[PDB]
Design an enzyme around this catalytic site. Structure first.
Site, PDB file in Angstrom:
ATOM      1  N   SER A 143      67.650  83.865  74.706  1.00 35.25           N
ATOM      2  CA  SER A 143      66.701  83.234  73.808  1.00 35.25           C
ATOM      3  C   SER A 143      67.096  83.557  72.377  1.00 35.25           C
ATOM      4  O   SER A 143      67.892  84.465  72.115  1.00 35.25           O
ATOM      5  CB  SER A 143      65.276  83.713  74.104  1.00 35.25           C
ATOM      6  OG  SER A 143      64.331  83.134  73.219  1.00 35.25           O
ATOM      7  N   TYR A 156      60.164  91.057  76.019  1.00 34.19           N
ATOM      8  CA  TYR A 156      60.983  89.850  76.088  1.00 34.19           C
ATOM      9  C   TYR A 156      62.181  89.950  75.153  1.00 34.19           C
ATOM     10  O   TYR A 156      63.312  89.628  75.539  1.00 34.19           O
ATOM     11  CB  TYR A 156      60.115  88.636  75.743  1.00 34.19           C
ATOM     12  CG  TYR A 156      60.748  87.284  75.981  1.00 34.19           C
ATOM     13  CD1 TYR A 156      60.614  86.636  77.204  1.00 34.19           C
ATOM     14  CD2 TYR A 156      61.455  86.643  74.974  1.00 34.19           C
ATOM     15  CE1 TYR A 156      61.181  85.400  77.421  1.00 34.19           C
ATOM     16  CE2 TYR A 156      62.023  85.405  75.181  1.00 34.19           C
ATOM     17  CZ  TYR A 156      61.883  84.786  76.404  1.00 34.19           C
ATOM     18  OH  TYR A 156      62.457  83.549  76.600  1.00 34.19           O
TER      19      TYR A 156
END
Lengths: 262, 231, 231, 262
Positions: A143, A156
């Site tokens: 990401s 995350y």
């Protein structure tokens, strides 16, 4: 008659969303695809039909990527049905928005296991076959949160940074072979993972208005003011799997509309 | 019938530019350029594309203007801009001549600025555009005796980011390609893959950047280096 | 008695350079510079250091040579080089005048190259040196309407890396400092800390880079930005 | 009469090596220091005397940073002996050199837990006190291996990248307070962790010659051709803890002799 014809690919997670687009674009390129997901059958038939619309063999599997035994079962099932795993797309992952102080440790463990360690298990299991065949692709769906940080996404961001570092190391360990390892770093893509966050924001600050919530969600991070599509991430994966990326190793392909450029 | 069919592109240097132009033509674009080289350039025309040669000094802004006008009158509005003009001078910083420093900055850094400035309004009006800047791994990491080159490449990447940000909401994207080396020990020093990067691979990267899939790829680098920057 | 006592330093611009010079003097170095500003510069001399004013145009190489010779005759061999000469022009790339682009590159990028080239042999002979380049966060990320500035800062960081690599095995180190903004919405756009960065903090970063603890800090950035580049 | 006078600091690991230098430099700056280590008492008395030579209160603790209960015990012990934890240096970690194919999963889990998740536990436990006091420092000892990759260090590179991403997120979540979170990325530092690798290399390629092994070890990665000292890492930590770093947030201080610059 296609660039990826005969290639066997395995997408480990996100049957809906980014995994769907990646599978569709790999199938369009001529590769057989195995879609793995943590769900059983909400709309999986529609997904499989969309992927199989391109005339390639398509298979569906349900493995919990946090369990190495299930990852090995997935790889062996792919070998049984289609053949040696040649294009491993590690795309499993979840999200949990919370400040560090109140972040549950169990959610930290889950995010690390699913977003980081699953890629390690899948790569460890698939690398021998690729080395023996002299060819292989390992595409890790990282990401932008793996290159920069965002508030209340400690687990995350940590897992995605780690997946990028793991990509670097694997690429270095295979640099002399025909196996390349790279990562894709998408920005915001409208998926259930992102839809849930949007809905939370809408109910928190915007009286439940999804349109305003989406506007604010994008305007916070993406200069382009528009979502990245699952089709674009699939195109990036196809490019990384193509011969033109024979010498692309250990790098990142960022599809984020300018998120990281600022 | 092709991904880039009907697109007007320019490569400002070459010989990576030759491979970039070849792979762009294979994708259907009509390209402009700037013993074996002649054979390859003649071969480039063998893909049903309108290819035009040129020789413009990218240090002079007026010559860049002349190249852009020649492109837009000979073929049509410029839609793909591949800035690949560059010169390399290897020397320690202490003994680095200021003339070569200025030449490197002008050819590798400012020429891209001039070309982008000239081409951008047309893309704005047309609502579409691709600006692909041929940086290198030297634009991300440093190397000894490459002061001017590394500085110019870093500046080029910064300019890439700025241009992409300024055009984030439009159909124009700006990105940079960072290649590595294009016998064993020289690669072992920097490229862990111990193999060169073909001009064909750089051209493929440019074609991907120009393809529709990269409509949301803005302001980032595409590194084709065999792992150089991963360590 | 101090960490930097007995060191000769030069700041090529200012007004971050004022804070850098002040914090360097507080550490004991003797510094050269290049209504309230006069008060602050007079105050800088209040730490038992030999402070000298100057006004040199860093665009002209001969003037940089004159500044270096004035420093090395007035105070002694240059041992700390703080390149902080810079100019900012905000404008879209389409309407960005080429004159200001050249000025920004010359003052922010090439001036540091000239100063480093002039000062490096002395540090080589003396076996010690600090080259601190005042880049900004614009040298790491991009911002709209900052084409020349961002390109120059990126190039400066690349040159920093190259110089540090060329002097890795010596006692000379080269590093760069990247500050952010130095009312609420403007910071909220870029700096998540929503507070400015003081010139004192940049000066502290420079002093740390020049201190012995940074003998093995080479070719990297020190970002003082309140979190700008962390997102 | 010192910059860090009255500050209570906690170093979580590496009692020998980098942790030692960090503790020494923090004590020199006037801070009380608690040294935590996974060992009991090989030479810990000499370490504590070296740290206490600067006239500040020094304490010694033995907590397994992989166990959140032990991390909480460490924090509470620090609060009991010295006071509120104000400077948290997360420095726990181990190393395991192995290619991905043969990398044991248990070693992957251990490296992730000790090098990445321990920082999460310690930060989660210490942040409330820092927020209530309006001041705090959280210094994470990352590695150059957190910015780039190295062969046969997949778990270590992943964990260190993750620790950098975690640093970014924590800094963002505290950007408006007097609490700053940053990371240090040292290159090669001659420590037992590095001495073990050097000895392995010497016995593998250099007939057991430690001098040649060290030469090759440094020449591979560090352009400076010399080790970073624990004292220099301690100086970087002191700088990050000083008022001059009040606005340094979510960034990295790399002390590597040019490793990452190339």
């Amino acid at each position: 008659k296609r660039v990826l014809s005969g290639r066997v690919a395995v997408v480990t997670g996100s049957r809906k969303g980014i995994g769907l687009g990646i599978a569709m674009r790999l199938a369009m390129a001529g590769a057989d695809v195995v879609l793995n997901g943590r769900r059983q059958s909400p709309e999986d038939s529609a997904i499989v039909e969309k992927v199989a619309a391109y005339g390639t063999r398509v298979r569906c599997f349900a493995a919990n990527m946090k369990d190495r035994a299930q990852v090995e079962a997935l790889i062996k099932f792919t070998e049984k049905e289609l053949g040696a795993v040649e294009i491993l797309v590690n795309n499993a992952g979840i999200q949990h928005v919370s400040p560090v102080e109140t972040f549950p440790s169990d959610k930290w463990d889950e995010i690390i296991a699913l977003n980081l360690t699953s890629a390690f298990h899948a790569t460890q299991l698939c690398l021998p076959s690729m080395r023996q065949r002299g060819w292989g692709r390992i595409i890790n769906i990282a990401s932008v949160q793996g290159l920069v940080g965002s508030m209340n996404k400690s687990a995350y961001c940590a897992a995605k940074h780690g997946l990028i570092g793991f990509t670097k190391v694997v690429a270095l360990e295979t640099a002399t072979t025909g196996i390349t390892c790279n990562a894709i770093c998408p920005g915001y893509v409208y998926t259930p993972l992102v839809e849930e966050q949007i809905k939370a924001v809408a109910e928190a600050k915007y009286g439940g208005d999804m349109e305003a919530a989406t506007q604010a969600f994008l305007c916070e991070k993406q200069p382009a003011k528009a979502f990245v599509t699952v089709e674009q991430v699939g195109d990036a994966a196809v490019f990384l799997a193509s011969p033109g990326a024979d010498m692309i190793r250990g790098t990142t392909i960022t599809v984020d509309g300018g998120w990281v450029a600022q």
